[PDB]
Design a protein around this ligand. Structure first.
Ligand SMILES: N[C@@H](CCC(=O)N[C@@H](CS)C(=O)NCC(=O)O)C(=O)O
Ligand SMILES: N[C@@H](CCC(=O)N[C@@H](CS)C(=O)NCC(=O)O)C(=O)O
Lengths: 212, 212
């Protein structure tokens, strides 16, 4: 059977994996998990047995179940090598992983749904904006040394796969991107590639009709 | 020159790297970065040029500067292969990375100093406890399927290197570990190994005298 991705249309972490799967040419099926309706499907007993962390994505592939988007992408990289998400040179690989982790560990978790719920309605917007602006202040500086056409040199990497979904989140939270011209430029360049379009939140099984 | 690690004695993420460096037998120097005194040395202009994200660890090695503890550890794994932080089988590698990311992306960032400062004095303790108990609820369930002597089978891996420092944080935040017998058992087993002792917060250049 085809690999099965458990995804939510609006989920940044899910988008990451959908981009990687498109990049690697892997035909997969999606099982949508609605993260918001009736408290969220991620809390169901069935989904909790799939991922005790109660998050998407989860990928069933090659007879196993993998959670954590970067762990998934590293698995895909090791088993379906081309196109490469990571370059061959260990020093350049470290830079790609550094940027991916800055986003995936340093920004996204602090603006995740469950965290925003704990912050509360009155402060969640400002909180999300602060986390993202702080992260992008740093990332924009780093990209001055690392970026070519893309985040790390001239080939698409895992850092780019993390960048686009986090920038879309920045737009959703009404963050001013004008002080981040390099993030902005690279984001536009990546969005011109088919693998970032076919995988897009507005083209998902579970995209609400009003957003298609 | 020897590799230079920028570290804080109490930093969980720094401990990770110190364990990996000990594991790989790499002789290194530490430059302490005091994260608390006078607002924190991580905000100095000099440290900001080292790491715009204003966090430890940072490692200078082989003529480059790497930030992000998991990116550092993956670099060390690729360049100094034994003892292995990741197993040879891509499916087992995915499990090690999943657990490492659960901790490093799913728990630690939400109990980091800068986040606790934004939560505020009145709520930070309860916040940290909630994040850690939620993460450990999930992790303890996952380890039921994955763990042998250690988090993933019978060889120490990157998941173990992430586990111990996060458990020490759990102790510092007064989290009840009694419902986590597998995390507790594995933690005790790893703490019996020299590489987790030589690297310990209480044996650092910058350990306050009262804690030595
Ligand atoms: N570090 C993770 C985080 C996964 C995650 O936070 N997923 C979000 C969607 S982007 C989620 O399922 N949140 C559910 C919730 O907050 O209740 C990974 O990269 O897979
Ligand atoms: N994802 C990171 C996080 C690094 C991090 O949060 N470091 C903490 C120490 S454990 C820090 O320097 N915090 C400084 C602050 O919060 O101002 C990594 O694994 O290196």
């Amino acid at each position: 059977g085809k690999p099965i991705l458990y995804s939510y249309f609006r989920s940044s972490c899910s988008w990451r994996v959908r981009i990687a799967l498109a990049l690697k040419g892997i035909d997969y099926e999606i099982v949508p998990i609605n993260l918001i309706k009736d408290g969220g499907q991620q809390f169901t007993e069935e989904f909790q047995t799939l991922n005790p962390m109660k998050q998407v994505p989860a990928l069933k592939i090659d007879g196993i179940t993998i959670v954590q988007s970067l762990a998934i992408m590293e698995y895909l990289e090791e088993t379906r090598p081309i196109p490469r998400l990571l370059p061959q040179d260990p020093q350049k690989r470290a830079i790609v992983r550094m940027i991916s982790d800055l986003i995936a560990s340093g920004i996204q978790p602090l603006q995740n749904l469950s965290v925003l719920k704990q912050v509360g309605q009155e402060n969640q917007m400002q909180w999300a904006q602060k986390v993202i602006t702080s992260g992008f202040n740093a990332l924009e500086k780093i990209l001055q040394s690392t970026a070519g056409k893309y985040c790390v040199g001239d080939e698409v990497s895992m850092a780019d796969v993390c960048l686009v979904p986090q920038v879309a989140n920045a737009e959703r939270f009404k963050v001013d991107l004008s002080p981040y011209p390099t993030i902005s430029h690279i984001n536009k360049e990546l969005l011109a590639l088919e693998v970032f379009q076919v995988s897009h939140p507005r083209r998902q099984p579970d995209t609400p009709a009003e957003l298609r």
